[PDB]
């Protein structure tokens, strides 16, 4: 459904980001992968996109925690793609600790990437989409953008802001043919959560995978993880014309996390 | 995208219901419509379905406001298709008036259909899906299942109820291959809506299309109606394996209505 | 605080409702209580209520599930008070049980009491509060009016309904000097809940005071029961002048229940 | 009554913060105000707080936008009041502008003061309350912490961030005797707002009162601004025992803003 569209995905050299660039390409969209890692992989990964889906893939490095760098990013990203229809702010970092102790430097880091990066990101993007008369800004928030969890102050503060920011963007460009929504995922066994499948498994020491099928049991009623492909799928739906009038809202995939 | 699957939509003889079945059929699925009207209009709609999408289309009458009648409906609808994977409880009605002047028979009439029917249609269908190991319950609430408007008590109550019933249904069958979600549409220009557009037309004694754009410019920030066709597309998505972990939540297609 | 103010509280011969009336009286209001029980016990509460707080207290039996009786109730209750400034629709019932197995009668009754009863009582009251230019309609919903939970479909539904209905009331009478909010309590150790604690203690075969701690843990993080006197104090406050602008919202007292 | 207890209110030299401190004092609590302004107007309000409520009112200058400054502030404040029982993080600023034109400097300033400040404030304040076993943290978010309005990206994002932070604060200190809640008020006629009123006045060609009516008209059903005094009443209620079990939730006084 997305043939001929130009999309950009932040933090997409791995995890949920990569799975998304994956599905958008499959939908027939040219994509601008972004993130960190061994140049080799990133290339094998970008290279592999044009192979599976027959679209054009481009890689641009950018530490999206820096406002200007981020803004200069999308601009170059757009230059490479020769346009900019779909922007998906996905890059993000997680840190655990009770407030009174949360490192001050970590707090600023999460806010700067998990939230601020979304704003500047959008800022630069909008003029282009506005000019065109069509656009899909897809912010990747999380359950923790609607509800809260212990010792994740910074992460929850950030995501809650992302969701809120999403609304503003939606209303501000209402009817313009442009939409902004925020996918709010649950438990996705990636490195960001694998660090918590082993942390919760050292305070009990019990099986490393028992601390997982347990990790879920406490938050996700489905007792099953949410696969990145599925998220990429949701990003594809948001980009369809079926969603022309779905703006400023949140789309949750959390095995029933928010239902209770 | 749904080849083989069997679907059912209450109140699908016209309006949003009909559009729902149409996209489910278009996606390759046998559907069972239902509703009121001139058998002539119903038969053409039922047949146009088998003709345009090359699938089996069954018609079943039932005054879903009747308990055993609706529960019976479900089973008889399961024999018609020879199984039952998707259920779209979309039947519903309306009445405008201030709380202290809302006929008690209207209050009832609404709660019976708009809320109770979803309950009876579910309980009847659940045992079936539970045995198949797969299932989809799509309840068509509204924006009035999240926020409220004047002189629509009954309707706002039942929707707020369908949303909460949706939540419960999702939790009781988590990880069983069955998901339950609520589509909370915004203004869709149907007859149920055309009735209020005309009431505004006369109240302010203004144009009929001038009274339309007004109804929008009050709740729908996009100033654009939500096409039934899109809602049928959002229903198709809730059926895709992409939404296997999307359960017990609402899917707002409202042009910004709940963003503010 | 409320010296002189004339209040009414459905289902107050016991538990939460009795508390709601107790703080109301304690705050200087004349109160009308109602509900089932032994005419002896009922007289005692009404009795104590009078001489302990120095205000008039009346009783009025009426089965609130009877739409017609309940309306005659407020008018009747209004006559004894010679006014009606505050209305608290508190009465309600529970019934644990899956969906495919929820007795249609158990659903009908909870819907008739927990939801419909609120509507009628409000319709029968608004008129009075409207003419005087001051009113307080305090609805007792529940966290389950905000989020769902297994085997409690009828309850969770009706509760969402109340929150939704509450909003409509507030909007229809906004500015008139009448406010409408919904108190949403967490676990309150009352007969209604003890009954569930006695089931968990039965199912798991553990100590009763233990099952109580286990009940709390699951949904209520504070691990401390919400107290009646508390919900009472909250109801009082909603009647203060600070609340004057607080209308059509939910006041949640659940020890974190809905925060996660 | 809060006699004995000690309280702190950021940004209280005027506006909502000032009315907040006046109510806690009237309740009998010794308070510490903070903010900017003319040392005479500051020292004036400070005096009235003692000469009118018979309590101790200390003053402390500090640019809450600075992480360390706010962390020492609560430090000195505690040492000043000889303790810290109630923290009211109120300090905040606004700036209207559409995402694409919203000043980067203007953004980071709003985030540092409308979100981060709440963080550090809470970070230094907790240790004290934790050791005491009792505490109250009152965050002054806004209706824009639940919903969104155009051209307020920074502000909306920050508020949600707060409503978000509020939850983690509560959860983390759940059952400890310390609660965290957020007051999300609607339009409160203050400078911050008179500025938005004078923008609609000179940008539409009409009275400064013609615009006010509109300001409310659009978002506030009650068509009446919320009074800074009422907010204080809320804050007082939150510090009461009636609210011992009310934690991690928002307390909205918007006049129906969020009900629709
Ligand atoms: N893992 C989960 O359960 C889960 C749940 C909900 C939401 N999310 C979100 O999904 C998105 C990706 O998280 P993840 O799980 O994939 O973690 P990840 O570790 O798997 O991915 C982080 C991605 O961001 C890149 N990144 C590194 N530095 C960056 C920078 N300065 N700017 C931008 N990107 C940078 C990484 O190299 C990587 O590609 C995030 O914003 C996170 O909110 C994850
Ligand atoms: N129009 C909107 O803006 C809008 C917005 C939100 C939700 N909805 C919902 O969409 C669904 C359809 O509403 P609509 O706009 O299509 O109105 P409609 O008038 O267009 O459709 C009502 C459908 O129900 C059928 N119906 C008649 N009697 C019935 C009965 N006894 N039992 C079951 N169905 C019966 C009708 O024949 C028709 O097919 C509803 O539940 C309504 O909540 C509509
Ligand atoms: N216990 C909790 O944790 C909890 C939590 C949230 C909400 N609530 C609500 O508090 C309200 C009171 O519940 P409860 O815990 O006090 O149960 P309860 O058993 O303690 O009280 C029920 C009250 O309703 C009366 N009642 C009996 N038949 C009635 C009828 N036909 N019509 C009206 N009232 C009738 C009862 O005699 C009693 O006074 C309810 O609507 C329930 O939703 C309770
Ligand atoms: N006015 C409204 O309608 C309204 C509505 C919702 C929320 N609020 C909130 O009320 C709180 C106060 O807003 P306001 O309306 O009173 O604006 P205000 O202009 O009236 O008050 C701003 C307060 O912050 C102080 N301030 C100055 N520099 C500061 C600094 N560096 N750090 C901290 N504080 C500083 C000011 O001196 C003043 O006391 C805010 O966080 C704002 O969210 C106001
Ligand atoms: Ca929740
Ligand atoms: Ca709203
Ligand atoms: Cl947690
Ligand atoms: Cl309205
Ligand atoms: Cl707006």
mmCIF file with all atom_site columns, C-alpha atoms and ligand atoms in Angstrom, chain C residues 11-16 36 63-64 90-92 113 140-142 155 159 185-188 190-193, ligand 3:
data_model
loop_
_atom_site.group_PDB
_atom_site.id
_atom_site.type_symbol
_atom_site.label_atom_id
_atom_site.label_alt_id
_atom_site.label_comp_id
_atom_site.label_asym_id
_atom_site.label_entity_id
_atom_site.label_seq_id
_atom_site.pdbx_PDB_ins_code
_atom_site.Cartn_x
_atom_site.Cartn_y
_atom_site.Cartn_z
_atom_site.occupancy
_atom_site.B_iso_or_equiv
_atom_site.pdbx_formal_charge
_atom_site.auth_seq_id
_atom_site.auth_comp_id
_atom_site.auth_asym_id
_atom_site.auth_atom_id
_atom_site.pdbx_PDB_model_num
ATOM   1  C CA  . UNK C 1 11  ? -27.956 2.369  49.739 1.00 0.00 ? 11  UNK C CA  1
ATOM   2  C CA  . UNK C 1 12  ? -26.782 3.812  53.016 1.00 0.00 ? 12  UNK C CA  1
ATOM   3  C CA  . UNK C 1 13  ? -28.138 1.452  55.684 1.00 0.00 ? 13  UNK C CA  1
ATOM   4  C CA  . UNK C 1 14  ? -24.742 -0.213 55.510 1.00 0.00 ? 14  UNK C CA  1
ATOM   5  C CA  . UNK C 1 15  ? -21.107 -0.052 54.377 1.00 0.00 ? 15  UNK C CA  1
ATOM   6  C CA  . UNK C 1 16  ? -19.745 2.760  52.204 1.00 0.00 ? 16  UNK C CA  1
ATOM   7  C CA  . UNK C 1 36  ? -32.356 -2.968 52.863 1.00 0.00 ? 36  UNK C CA  1
ATOM   8  C CA  . UNK C 1 63  ? -35.949 -0.900 45.783 1.00 0.00 ? 63  UNK C CA  1
ATOM   9  C CA  . UNK C 1 64  ? -33.775 1.234  43.501 1.00 0.00 ? 64  UNK C CA  1
ATOM   10 C CA  . UNK C 1 90  ? -24.153 4.721  46.088 1.00 0.00 ? 90  UNK C CA  1
ATOM   11 C CA  . UNK C 1 91  ? -26.205 1.506  46.094 1.00 0.00 ? 91  UNK C CA  1
ATOM   12 C CA  . UNK C 1 92  ? -24.816 -1.428 44.080 1.00 0.00 ? 92  UNK C CA  1
ATOM   13 C CA  . UNK C 1 113 ? -29.012 -1.023 39.952 1.00 0.00 ? 113 UNK C CA  1
ATOM   14 C CA  . UNK C 1 140 ? -20.071 6.246  43.416 1.00 0.00 ? 140 UNK C CA  1
ATOM   15 C CA  . UNK C 1 141 ? -18.497 4.402  40.476 1.00 0.00 ? 141 UNK C CA  1
ATOM   16 C CA  . UNK C 1 142 ? -15.202 2.506  40.962 1.00 0.00 ? 142 UNK C CA  1
ATOM   17 C CA  . UNK C 1 155 ? -19.864 -4.608 37.207 1.00 0.00 ? 155 UNK C CA  1
ATOM   18 C CA  . UNK C 1 159 ? -19.254 1.304  36.353 1.00 0.00 ? 159 UNK C CA  1
ATOM   19 C CA  . UNK C 1 185 ? -12.709 3.735  45.227 1.00 0.00 ? 185 UNK C CA  1
ATOM   20 C CA  . UNK C 1 186 ? -10.199 0.887  45.362 1.00 0.00 ? 186 UNK C CA  1
ATOM   21 C CA  . UNK C 1 187 ? -10.659 -2.144 47.646 1.00 0.00 ? 187 UNK C CA  1
ATOM   22 C CA  . UNK C 1 188 ? -12.753 -1.192 50.706 1.00 0.00 ? 188 UNK C CA  1
ATOM   23 C CA  . UNK C 1 190 ? -16.888 -4.235 53.268 1.00 0.00 ? 190 UNK C CA  1
ATOM   24 C CA  . UNK C 1 191 ? -19.317 -7.170 53.094 1.00 0.00 ? 191 UNK C CA  1
ATOM   25 C CA  . UNK C 1 192 ? -19.380 -6.820 49.294 1.00 0.00 ? 192 UNK C CA  1
ATOM   26 C CA  . UNK C 1 193 ? -15.632 -7.459 49.228 1.00 0.00 ? 193 UNK C CA  1
HETATM 27 N N1  . LIG E 2 .   ? -16.286 -2.312 48.619 1.00 0.00 ? 3   LIG E N1  1
HETATM 28 C C1  . LIG E 2 .   ? -15.483 -1.763 47.691 1.00 0.00 ? 3   LIG E C1  1
HETATM 29 O O1  . LIG E 2 .   ? -14.221 -1.989 47.645 1.00 0.00 ? 3   LIG E O1  1
HETATM 30 C C2  . LIG E 2 .   ? -16.056 -0.869 46.689 1.00 0.00 ? 3   LIG E C2  1
HETATM 31 C C3  . LIG E 2 .   ? -15.138 -0.342 45.754 1.00 0.00 ? 3   LIG E C3  1
HETATM 32 C C4  . LIG E 2 .   ? -15.635 0.553  44.733 1.00 0.00 ? 3   LIG E C4  1
HETATM 33 C C5  . LIG E 2 .   ? -17.007 0.895  44.673 1.00 0.00 ? 3   LIG E C5  1
HETATM 34 N N2  . LIG E 2 .   ? -17.840 0.318  45.649 1.00 0.00 ? 3   LIG E N2  1
HETATM 35 C C6  . LIG E 2 .   ? -19.270 0.691  45.586 1.00 0.00 ? 3   LIG E C6  1
HETATM 36 O O2  . LIG E 2 .   ? -19.680 1.251  46.823 1.00 0.00 ? 3   LIG E O2  1
HETATM 37 C C7  . LIG E 2 .   ? -21.172 1.192  46.746 1.00 0.00 ? 3   LIG E C7  1
HETATM 38 C C8  . LIG E 2 .   ? -21.596 0.397  47.966 1.00 0.00 ? 3   LIG E C8  1
HETATM 39 O O3  . LIG E 2 .   ? -20.998 -0.914 47.826 1.00 0.00 ? 3   LIG E O3  1
HETATM 40 P P1  . LIG E 2 .   ? -20.713 -1.593 49.249 1.00 0.00 ? 3   LIG E P1  1
HETATM 41 O O4  . LIG E 2 .   ? -19.323 -2.036 49.305 1.00 0.00 ? 3   LIG E O4  1
HETATM 42 O O5  . LIG E 2 .   ? -20.994 -0.636 50.307 1.00 0.00 ? 3   LIG E O5  1
HETATM 43 O O6  . LIG E 2 .   ? -21.610 -2.906 49.391 1.00 0.00 ? 3   LIG E O6  1
HETATM 44 P P2  . LIG E 2 .   ? -22.519 -2.978 50.725 1.00 0.00 ? 3   LIG E P2  1
HETATM 45 O O7  . LIG E 2 .   ? -22.949 -4.351 50.712 1.00 0.00 ? 3   LIG E O7  1
HETATM 46 O O8  . LIG E 2 .   ? -21.629 -2.711 51.887 1.00 0.00 ? 3   LIG E O8  1
HETATM 47 O O9  . LIG E 2 .   ? -23.645 -1.915 50.468 1.00 0.00 ? 3   LIG E O9  1
HETATM 48 C C9  . LIG E 2 .   ? -24.757 -2.072 49.515 1.00 0.00 ? 3   LIG E C9  1
HETATM 49 C C10 . LIG E 2 .   ? -25.731 -0.977 50.016 1.00 0.00 ? 3   LIG E C10 1
HETATM 50 O O10 . LIG E 2 .   ? -26.875 -1.044 49.066 1.00 0.00 ? 3   LIG E O10 1
HETATM 51 C C11 . LIG E 2 .   ? -28.102 -1.454 49.772 1.00 0.00 ? 3   LIG E C11 1
HETATM 52 N N3  . LIG E 2 .   ? -28.936 -2.144 48.839 1.00 0.00 ? 3   LIG E N3  1
HETATM 53 C C12 . LIG E 2 .   ? -29.607 -3.391 49.024 1.00 0.00 ? 3   LIG E C12 1
HETATM 54 N N4  . LIG E 2 .   ? -30.506 -3.640 48.076 1.00 0.00 ? 3   LIG E N4  1
HETATM 55 C C13 . LIG E 2 .   ? -30.584 -2.487 47.339 1.00 0.00 ? 3   LIG E C13 1
HETATM 56 C C14 . LIG E 2 .   ? -31.387 -2.075 46.266 1.00 0.00 ? 3   LIG E C14 1
HETATM 57 N N5  . LIG E 2 .   ? -32.334 -2.919 45.697 1.00 0.00 ? 3   LIG E N5  1
HETATM 58 N N6  . LIG E 2 .   ? -31.209 -0.803 45.828 1.00 0.00 ? 3   LIG E N6  1
HETATM 59 C C15 . LIG E 2 .   ? -30.330 0.039  46.362 1.00 0.00 ? 3   LIG E C15 1
HETATM 60 N N7  . LIG E 2 .   ? -29.501 -0.281 47.392 1.00 0.00 ? 3   LIG E N7  1
HETATM 61 C C16 . LIG E 2 .   ? -29.673 -1.558 47.824 1.00 0.00 ? 3   LIG E C16 1
HETATM 62 C C17 . LIG E 2 .   ? -27.503 -2.297 50.858 1.00 0.00 ? 3   LIG E C17 1
HETATM 63 O O11 . LIG E 2 .   ? -28.476 -2.619 51.900 1.00 0.00 ? 3   LIG E O11 1
HETATM 64 C C18 . LIG E 2 .   ? -26.316 -1.462 51.326 1.00 0.00 ? 3   LIG E C18 1
HETATM 65 O O12 . LIG E 2 .   ? -26.725 -0.322 52.104 1.00 0.00 ? 3   LIG E O12 1
HETATM 66 C C19 . LIG E 2 .   ? -21.529 0.411  45.478 1.00 0.00 ? 3   LIG E C19 1
HETATM 67 O O13 . LIG E 2 .   ? -22.254 0.757  44.235 1.00 0.00 ? 3   LIG E O13 1
HETATM 68 C C20 . LIG E 2 .   ? -20.240 -0.331 45.130 1.00 0.00 ? 3   LIG E C20 1
HETATM 69 O O14 . LIG E 2 .   ? -19.970 0.026  43.745 1.00 0.00 ? 3   LIG E O14 1
HETATM 70 C C21 . LIG E 2 .   ? -17.390 -0.544 46.637 1.00 0.00 ? 3   LIG E C21 1
#
